[PDB]
Design a protein around this motif. Structure first.
Motif, mmCIF file in Angstrom:
data_model
loop_
_atom_site.group_PDB
_atom_site.id
_atom_site.type_symbol
_atom_site.label_atom_id
_atom_site.label_comp_id
_atom_site.label_asym_id
_atom_site.label_seq_id
_atom_site.Cartn_x
_atom_site.Cartn_y
_atom_site.Cartn_z
ATOM 1 N N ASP A 174 36.653 34.025 -40.514
ATOM 2 C CA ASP A 174 36.218 35.065 -39.614
ATOM 3 C C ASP A 174 34.798 34.784 -39.378
ATOM 4 O O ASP A 174 34.099 34.678 -40.357
ATOM 5 C CB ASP A 174 36.288 36.465 -40.186
ATOM 6 C CG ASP A 174 36.290 37.487 -39.110
ATOM 7 O OD1 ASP A 174 35.745 37.247 -37.996
ATOM 8 O OD2 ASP A 174 37.101 38.402 -39.185
ATOM 9 N N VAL A 176 32.804 37.289 -38.055
ATOM 10 C CA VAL A 176 32.237 38.643 -37.976
ATOM 11 C C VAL A 176 31.744 39.129 -36.634
ATOM 12 O O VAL A 176 31.966 40.255 -36.304
ATOM 13 C CB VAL A 176 31.158 38.896 -38.979
ATOM 14 C CG1 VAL A 176 31.590 40.001 -39.868
ATOM 15 C CG2 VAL A 176 30.985 37.730 -39.796
ATOM 16 N N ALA A 185 36.087 45.458 -35.803
ATOM 17 C CA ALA A 185 36.050 44.147 -36.453
ATOM 18 C C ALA A 185 37.114 43.049 -36.092
ATOM 19 O O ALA A 185 37.488 42.818 -34.898
ATOM 20 C CB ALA A 185 36.011 44.371 -37.913
ATOM 21 N N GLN A 186 37.432 42.255 -37.117
ATOM 22 C CA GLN A 186 38.202 41.034 -36.981
ATOM 23 C C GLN A 186 38.866 40.586 -38.276
ATOM 24 O O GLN A 186 39.841 39.807 -38.231
ATOM 25 C CB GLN A 186 37.221 39.971 -36.728
ATOM 26 C CG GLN A 186 35.871 40.534 -36.840
ATOM 27 C CD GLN A 186 34.811 39.702 -36.048
ATOM 28 O OE1 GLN A 186 33.988 40.321 -35.375
ATOM 29 N NE2 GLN A 186 34.815 38.330 -36.151
ATOM 30 N N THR A 187 38.113 40.726 -39.379
ATOM 31 C CA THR A 187 38.627 40.388 -40.677
ATOM 32 C C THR A 187 39.714 39.425 -40.381
ATOM 33 O O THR A 187 40.877 39.785 -40.441
ATOM 34 C CB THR A 187 39.159 41.621 -41.247
ATOM 35 O OG1 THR A 187 38.304 41.950 -42.322
ATOM 36 C CG2 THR A 187 40.610 41.470 -41.846
ATOM 37 N N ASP A 188 39.338 38.426 -39.613
ATOM 38 C CA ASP A 188 40.315 37.529 -39.062
ATOM 39 C C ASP A 188 39.595 36.239 -38.900
ATOM 40 O O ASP A 188 38.453 36.268 -38.450
ATOM 41 C CB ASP A 188 40.825 37.996 -37.708
ATOM 42 C CG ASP A 188 39.828 37.748 -36.584
ATOM 43 O OD1 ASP A 188 40.284 37.465 -35.471
ATOM 44 O OD2 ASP A 188 38.591 37.883 -36.651
#
Ligand code: CNC
Ligand SMILES: CCCCCCCCOCCOCCOCCOCCO
Ligand SMILES: CCCCCCCCOCCOCCOCCOCCO
Ligand SMILES: CCCCCCCCOCCOCCOCCOCCO
Ligand SMILES: CCCCCCCCOCCOCCOCCOCCO
Ligand SMILES: CCCCCCCCOCCOCCOCCOCCO
Ligand SMILES: CCCCCCCCOCCOCCOCCOCCO
Ligand SMILES: [Ca+2]
Ligand SMILES: [Ca+2]
Ligand SMILES: [Ca+2]
Length: 584
Positions: A174, A176, A185-188
């Motif tokens: 990720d 951020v 967010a994304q936490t991805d």
């Protein structure tokens, strides 16, 4: 020296180019175990790159401290094709597999090429000669993975062919974002996938007359982050497709050189989230088509040459107003040598269908005052075309003039006791900078920059040790207001160390990214914040486990240095790659 051909468009020896040029070869790039164009570039003098993250993410290049659109990127002689509305090209998308050689010459060169040659020029070359067929790929630090097949061959005499396909993929991390997702967010991990295809034909009718045809293309998907309403779509993902074809003839005689070239390129760059998007939409598409045609001549006269061409462009992008645009230019070049004096020059008028006529020139004289030592001065004048966004945007102004540079530069260059060195000073004043007024929600040409930079390089051996090192200091400000521009390092330092031992070829590459200044979108009004600036180290090895098989390995970001080149985007961090090639 090494021919190189991107100063005046024809072959010529670097010695014989008064401006700082740098060349990167395959051997090089394979050594470097580079996995992107970005990687290669970041190494060379005068280049500042930044990334909204890791692989696949937008990126941005600042040659000697000019704006990111103030560089001309040529692929095989020919302007790239950055679609959308900001000059910025971002070679993050341009497959590295295609790259056989980069040729990079710093300083102005609009009097040859036209628009963008302001900082310097980056000509990426896709073309090999080096027959055989090749397999390879690699594995690593984020389920990164790559596979690839190459060959060139003859089909009888005076003809040879070349195909390449190449697949890379990674999951990423990720990054951020942080002032680009808004509510959440994304936490991805935000990965990248590219798949690529290249073919060539290559043909001599003789040992003077030759031709080609080429075709190549890629199909990238990368994932990014956005802004967010709960809502209300995202735009998570980008998907780009991009194909090119060329054709030329050349004739290379004992005195007179000629080339006629042709090319056509078309991309199509979808952004979208990600669920009912496409197609939605909720889904922006930017497409472009660039056509090109160019005919050039040079010939040998004196220990000099004179040369000239015409060079024609057409770019129709798709949406009612901004759409089809055309350029034509005509220039002249000259080299000569007299005594220990070289003089090298170039000039061009362009006629552009928005902004009409503009012209442009450069000079340099050198003086080799003692053998091996040489002092060069230069002066030069370049420019940059307005973009649709600027032109025909929501605060568009289709009457804009181009942006104007002047540059002076001074260098000493020497061989001394085994070391090849250079050092060099330049002022570049930019102006008629395109600068929107809150004022009135139109852009106008109004703003000025000054740049004062210094470039010092050296290379040498000691051991079986080889040293390639540079330093760069760029003071880039807004001339009016006298503040530092943004996202640029006043200071960089780049070393490479190569050596061979047992059969392990080793390299260690160091860089210091000096500290820089940017914007924290975390919160409006948006403020600038100073990033601290930092030291990286990577380690690379290869081994010829056979004779057909090389096997390599690379630890990048060798300690584990956290940092950004863009406030809020997480950079990579320590990665491994483990990689192999077979030949035959
Ligand atoms: C400014 C901005 C930004 N943008 Co634009 C947004 N949102 N946006 C723009 C606008 C700028 C207009 C202007 N600047 O006057 C604007 C309206 C043009 C726009 C454009 C676009 N936006 C796009 C994207 C992707 C994003 N944008 C960001 C760069 C997102 C940026 C996020 C960030 N970096 O913080 C951003 C929020 C801040 C960049 C910055 O100001 N740089 C300062 C300057 C010194 O650095 P620079 O390198 O010279 O910046 C230049 C570029 O980055 C460029 N540019 C802008 N966005 C893109 C996107 C692409 C693909 C490209 C190649 C260049 C850009 O314009 C700059 C200056 O003229 C982005 C990281 C935000 C986000 N989280 O995704 C992101 C890209 C994700 C990725 N890695 O591919 C679009 C695809 C949006 C859409 N789907 O239409 C698109 C493409 C433009 C194009 N020509 O292809
Ligand atoms: C036959 C034309 C050659 C020069 C074309 C480009 C000249 C642009 O300005 C050059 C003049 O400015 C300084 C003059 O001194 C050297 C001129 O160029 C020598 C080029 O080999
Ligand atoms: C082939 C060689 C090209 C030589 C070009 C360099 C010389 C350019 O001329 C001067 C630059 O500025 C042009 C205008 O000069 C004074 C203008 O005065 C009237 C203003 O409206
Ligand atoms: C064989 C092609 C010759 C191309 C040379 C054009 C170079 C640009 O001209 C010199 C640089 O700019 C100076 C011209 O600017 C003044 C424009 O004047 C045009 C008529 O007044
Ligand atoms: C800004 C550049 C300054 C360059 C000054 C160089 C001056 C002379 O340097 C080398 C001249 O040669 C003396 C060095 O060693 C002589 C080696 O010659 C071998 C036998 O004589
Ligand atoms: C001939 C190469 C110049 C070498 C640079 C180091 C020596 C500098 O001496 C005085 C310091 O200059 C202050 C400005 O530094 C940046 C200016 O750079 C070019 C702007 O014209
Ligand atoms: C740099 C002035 C000394 C004469 C040139 C020496 C040759 C440079 O080779 C070494 C280059 O690597 C780093 C050079 O750093 C020296 C210059 O930095 C000074 C900034 O004004
Ligand atoms: Ca994402
Ligand atoms: Ca005008
Ligand atoms: Ca000599």
């Amino acid at each position: 020296d090494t021919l190189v051909v991107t100063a005046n468009r024809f072959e010529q020896p670097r010695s014989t180019v008064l401006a700082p040029t740098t060349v990167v070869t395959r051997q090089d790039i394979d050594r470097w175990q580079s996995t992107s164009v970005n990687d290669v570039l970041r190494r060379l003098p005068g280049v500042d790159i930044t990334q909204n993250g890791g692989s696949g993410q937008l990126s941005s290049i600042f040659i000697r401290g000019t704006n990111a659109s103030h560089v001309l990127v040529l692929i095989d002689g020919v302007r790239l094709n950055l679609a959308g509305v900001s000059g910025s090209a971002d070679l993050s998308q341009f497959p590295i597999a295609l790259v056989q050689r980069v040729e990079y010459i710093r300083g102005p060169r609009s009097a040859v090429y036209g628009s963008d040659a302001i900082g310097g020029v980056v000509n990426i070359i896709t073309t090999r000669d080096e027959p055989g067929t090749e397999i390879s790929a690699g594995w690593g630090s984020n389920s990164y993975q790559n596979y690839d097949v190459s060959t060139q061959q003859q089909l009888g005499d005076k003809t040879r062919v070349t195909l390449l396909g190449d697949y890379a993929h990674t999951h990423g991390y990720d990054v951020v974002a942080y002032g680009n997702t808004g509510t959440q967010a994304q936490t991805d991990n935000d990965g990248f996938l590219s798949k690529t295809l290249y073919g060539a034909l290559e043909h001599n009718f003789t040992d003077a007359w030759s031709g080609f045809v080429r075709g190549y293309g890629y199909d990238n998907r990368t994932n990014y982050d956005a802004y967010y309403s709960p809502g209300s779509p995202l735009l998570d993902t980008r998907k780009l497709y991009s194909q090119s074809w060329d054709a030329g003839l050349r004739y290379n005689g004992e005195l007179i050189k000629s080339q006629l070239i042709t090319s056509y390129s078309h991309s199509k760059d979808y952004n979208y989230d990600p669920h009912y998007g496409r197609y939605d939409s909720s889904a922006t598409l930017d497409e472009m088509k660039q056509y090109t045609v160019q005919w050039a001549n040079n010939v040998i006269v004196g220990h000099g040459s004179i040369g000239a061409g015409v060079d024609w462009q057409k770019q129709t992008t798709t949406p009612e107003d901004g759409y089809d645009q055309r350029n034509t230019g005509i220039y002249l070049t000259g080299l000569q040598q007299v005594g220990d004096f070289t003089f090298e020059g170039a000039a061009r008028s362009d006629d552009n269908s928005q902004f009409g006529r503009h012209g442009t020139w450069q000079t340099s004289a050198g003086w080799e005052f003692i053998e091996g030592y040489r002092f060069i001065a230069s002066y030069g004048t370049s420019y940059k075309a307005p973009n649709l966004g600027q032109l025909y945007g929501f605060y568009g102004n289709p009457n804009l003039d181009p942006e104007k540079s002047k540059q002076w530069e001074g260098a000493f260059e020497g061989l001394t006791a085994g070391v090849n060195w250079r050092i060099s000073g330049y002022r570049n004043d930019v102006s008629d900078l395109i600068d929107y007024d809150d004022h009135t929600l139109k852009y106008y040409n109004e703003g000025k920059a000054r740049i004062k930079g210094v470039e010092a390089t050296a290379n040498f051996d000691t051991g079986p040790l080889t040293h390639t090192v540079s330093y760069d200091y760029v003071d880039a400000r807004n001339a009016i207001t006298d503040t530092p521009l943004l996202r640029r390092a006043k200071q960089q330092v780049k070393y490479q160390l190569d050596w061979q031992l047992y059969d392990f070829d080793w390299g260690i590459t160091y860089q210091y990214l000096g500290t820089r200044y940017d914007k924290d979108y975390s919160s409006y009004p948006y403020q600038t914040v100073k990033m601290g600036g930092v030291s990286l180290w990577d380690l690379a090895v290869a081994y010829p486990v056979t004779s057909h098989l090389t096997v390599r390995g690379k630890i990048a970001n060798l300690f584990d240095k956290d940092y950004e080149t863009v406030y809020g985007y997480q950079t990579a961090g320590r990665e491994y790659t483990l990689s192999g090639s077979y030949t035959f």
